[PDB]
Symmetry: D2
């Protein structure tokens, strides 16, 4: 199960570069040079890396210091064949964003956040990125009076509309992806799920330029079904990017390696992405636990790609099995794909076999046979077939 | 704190009429005649009642039996002044809906569900309802292979589009409201939150005819902030109806009386509905606990309306307090309402005070003073002011 | 992966016999005769069955009707070789238990509950049971004033002490196992976790006669780690019985077939039970989904035993792998098993290498190498080794 | 509602001294001198303060530096009348504790943790503390193979037994209190609830020396009823200390000011502590949100004490109301306090009115009248009585 750049696996600089600070503990690992991360990831078989502006260029850097951080990075990209398909803005670490970037109560902070964002869009375009992600981690509140949510959504729409106007006036080939999260670090975060972000996008001036960047663990922090949520995104034509990791239920954001946490949900997600032919990057937003040294950091990153490839094999075998294909027919998945009333409204109203003469007791007595189907999926997942 | 029909309080027949069957226990109360429920609710000061088709007309009734169930009901409505502002369809109790109504895998069940729905829309229009609610409680799955969610959303859109075509071809003055729920009775339910339902509506052929009917307890079953969710609905112009009750965290759907469960969230919800001038009915979808006899049933219903009126008083006092109005200015809620960049994009890009000359350390040092504000809200809620 | 009675798999009559009533829906399956259940389970390879009194003998039966229900049951047990290792009391379905059995506010209900329990202990002893389970599903409250919890724990201790006095005065060879659950059907249930039940047992007059009967899904309804909880039970010498099923997170009690829900936790549980040599029955308390007919009922029951046997194979292979045994040494699991200070207190206080001369920076820099270990467990679970 | 030292309100140095670092953000406030904290808290009306060793004495301090940190602190205590009733050990911040203190896999780390603990017990005794708290925040695991829980509980018992032997051999007047937490910062923490800690204590060599220190928010992170849990602690005679704060459901540990979060649960907790006459300190373990400057820090601390005093007034009024006292009799809370069978086992078995002649249908028909009672509690809480 060896990865190749063909598999389009990408990692953020901040993932393998996490030093291990949590709310109760100091760093257990030293800082990584972004040059060494690109090199070690290329040897593992990754396709590319992503960054926040402040991961690559330390906050407060002069214009010359900015120049050589970028130029060393580009040299490592050139030396390895590594791509940069996505980039994003840090609007959550500096104390100035403690009440938000785009929806901070202070007007002057909001304007700053937009200028800080615009500056990095230019850089992402320079480096070849096709997707620009926005994670509004500080947008929200800990108490009810602190934030009028309707005014906040007006400010959030204003910010995204202005960014839309910037990229089209520049002629940039880049699209935006909103990344939802229900809570942490704020008590409640605005646009808390994939659904809320999808609904919000339809009110932007140019909705074609915006999609979603869902994260496995984030929807699971609301106890939601992540494959179900991704299906609704694909059904709406809005899955621009995806963040893969593991999470063990409703609690703090664990960011475990992909495959850890809810293993069956990982299997159903891989099944769905491969079946629908999602062609974007398979991006890992995870943290190697702070119990680990650097050897365990690279072992954990290798594990992300390895688990994806195993699940892909098992899901392909599941769908290719003639016995599963007949069970799907037994469960009437073929009938679900057929229109309910292609004959139209008047014909349905005139169809006595749909009501007056419909035999409800016979239909009710039919088994769905879902449990035999699900055990075939288990058997395939576990390799007992 | 006496309710009057002016306050527009409504109750479902199935709420005060719940006999107390739960997954582990038999009924503790006998069945209510819908005639007696309308009478006892009118004396409590309610404005109206709502129904499922099968609450009013027992399933399998002939056309004559249907005729006198409706006619006795209309007589009680006439005798009391009680309204019927909403009605809905039972697509979840009969065994034939065990895999869903609109998205059942079996095509013939889907057609039946649509004919059963259409028949009750006619009746709701006859009785004066202006909102028709759809709660797809059986739409979803317990296992991943049982339901292809993209096909299911195609079937769900087909059903809602057909209902849209029916009411406009008839010239009916009625609009639809989708009621989300994340789980129970299925393992995962489709459109699990207000956000998912809002996003789905924008893909219907006639989106103006559809809104949402959120329930307090349902969003809290996903650990979400219910007032935040209602604000996004109002911001989108889609709050057609609301269901009020109480819930104690992430667990089974408790349906407690309104005010119970998360009391502070109830206060912030009432604040929001009154401040935005929501003019629809204040509908209670709750269950009197099965510990109670009929005297405790009516005591619990009285409690719903009473708690709403107390919270309304405390929230009005909060907003009218000159000391709270100055704290809101201290927290810069006035600045949140002002546009970030009414001067436009080019001016923002040319504004050095928004980046090059912006003093981030001074802005960061400013306190938001949210905790003083929130304690004023506490003091007002508890009546220590 | 064929089960044999050697594997000691048992099922409750109420599991395969569940008719499919949930809070929103009528039964989808007809009632099973307990005679046919014993026969179909024996052919699947089960070892035995368990019962509530009211599963076997319909409530309100005369003494003659009781006589032939038992006698038909015993004949089926004799015809199949099926055992009855556990039995329990229904103190939750009849309306008289709406506020509890052992801790009902009404004294006369509490006395009835004890007499109903005592009568079935006699029967369980007659049928050969060695464990008597108590699940206090109605013990608890929906509101804070309804139940003084200290008085309730006095009443709960009084009941269990009296049952203890009954079995020892009769000379019965039977022990009790308390089954915790955090909520549902009450808003909060007393003794909500394995921990609370373990602490309670130490205050009974004869603590040696009582242990716990934990359920997979119940601890997961509080977001807890079920293998961790079972380890604490084994460490205290109190794992008398276990209930196996699946559950998908914090929500209503799903009672899915074992292996479904959190698959990795099922693997770690099987690892622990086999490694510690737990010799009690492997009991399944599950519900075949109401989507299923009777063929899917037996398919789901077969699935429980099948998944246990696969996980047992994978866990044995994990522990037998020489490469995993060296990784465990790399992670210092051997050092965890060694005493911290067998040399005693004074020697530890006199040991400068434990404080004054301890090099904290060197110790901190050591990797735990937990992520390489965990991926070996993944590889073994998935059969990629 | 003015606090006085009579009310016995205490605060940790780390609470008002929190600088505002969270997993995604840098500090927003500067460090407090412990001298200024004691002074500002005394003026607010607090009774005392608590500390971790490393809050008071920076890690790595020499023996002289230790001498004047303590001596400046004692001078501020003397200047204000402030007490120090509790102290505890930091076994979670330094990287050396990344896999735990008492249950780290490395033996030499475990020995260090015990020596670091013993050193601070001596200091707490010197400063007058009567309770020593242990919060094992790093004890646990992120993956199943990393920690054998039975070996870990052997190591945890060994550590607590050794500390027990140390204080009794020294003749110290101090007792220990274990503080449970279900998760964060580890994926799962050992002894995750009040119940698990209570059960563990009964296996220590000298169980009389150990109790529990429960935290509001920690039990709510498992969705549990905190007043119920405190009742079981009081029933076992083990409530040695309590930590008060607010929390909004199952998510990260919010540590909000007391009264925030679940307000009704705060009311029922205050009712219980005052009714049972708990005489220990009312300790606040909270964090002023990082949105705040220092004026909002002291406003938030004032809010903790203020909300406690308001709830105490409302709960006293509730219990003193003659109409609530008669409702309690209506709900048969008086009967719950009476023994079920003081007449003994044989008399209960001979009592036909407890089974053969018991009229179950009459008993079942009685209403519990819990909803009228609970609305009286609401009315009293909100000051509408
Ligand atoms: Mg995350
Ligand atoms: Mg992410
Ligand atoms: Mg509900
Ligand atoms: Mg509802
Ligand atoms: Mg269960
Ligand atoms: Mg069970
Ligand atoms: Mg805490
Ligand atoms: Mg604490």
């Amino acid at each position: 199960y060896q990865p190749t750049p063909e598999d389009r696996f990408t990692f953020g600089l901040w993932t393998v570069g996490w030093q291990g600070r949590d709310p109760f503990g100091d760093a257990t690992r030293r800082a990584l040079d972004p040059v060494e991360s690109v090199r070690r990831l290329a040897e593992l078989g990754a396709h590319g890396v992503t960054f926040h502006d402040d991961d690559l260029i330390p906050f407060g850097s002069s214009d010359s210091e900015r120049e050589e951080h970028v130029k060393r990075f580009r040299q490592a990209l050139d030396d390895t064949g590594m791509k940069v398909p996505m980039a994003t803005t840090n609007l959550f670490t500096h104390p100035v964003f403690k009440d938000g970037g785009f929806t901070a109560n202070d007007r002057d902070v909001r304007r700053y956040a937009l200028r800080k964002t615009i500056r990095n869009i230019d850089l992402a375009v320079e480096l070849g990125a096709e997707t620009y992600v926005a994670w509004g981690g500080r947008e929200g509140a800990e108490s009810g009076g602190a934030k009028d949510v309707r005014d906040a959504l007006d400010r959030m729409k204003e910010a995204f509309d202005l960014l839309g106007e910037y990229v089209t006036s520049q002629g940039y080939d880049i699209r935006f992806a909103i990344e939802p999260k229900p809570n942490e670090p704020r008590g409640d975060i605005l646009l808390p799920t994939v659904g809320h972000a999808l609904a919000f996008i339809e009110r932007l001036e140019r909705p074609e330029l915006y999609g979603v960047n869902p994260e496995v663990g984030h929807e699971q922090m609301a106890g939601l079904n992540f494959p179900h949520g991704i299906a609704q995104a694909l059904w709406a034509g809005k899955l621009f990017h995806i963040d893969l990791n593991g999470q063990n239920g409703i609690k703090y954001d664990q960011d475990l390696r992909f495959g850890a946490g809810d293993l069956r949900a990982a299997f159903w997600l891989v099944d769905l992405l491969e079946s629908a032919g999602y062609s974007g990057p398979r991006h890992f937003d995870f943290k190697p636990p702070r119990t680990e040294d650097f050897d365990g950091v690279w072992a954990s990153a290798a594990g992300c790609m390895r688990n994806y490839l195993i699940l892909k094999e098992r899901a392909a075998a599941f769908r290719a099995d003639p016995e599963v294909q007949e069970a799907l027919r037994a469960s009437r998945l073929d009938e679900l794909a057929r229109p309910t009333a292609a004959d139209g409204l008047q014909a349905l109203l005139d169809d006595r076999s749909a009501f007056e003469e419909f035999d409800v007791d016979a239909a009710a007595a039919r088994g769905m046979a879902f449990e035999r189907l699900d055990q075939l999926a288990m058997d395939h997942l576990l390799g007992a077939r």
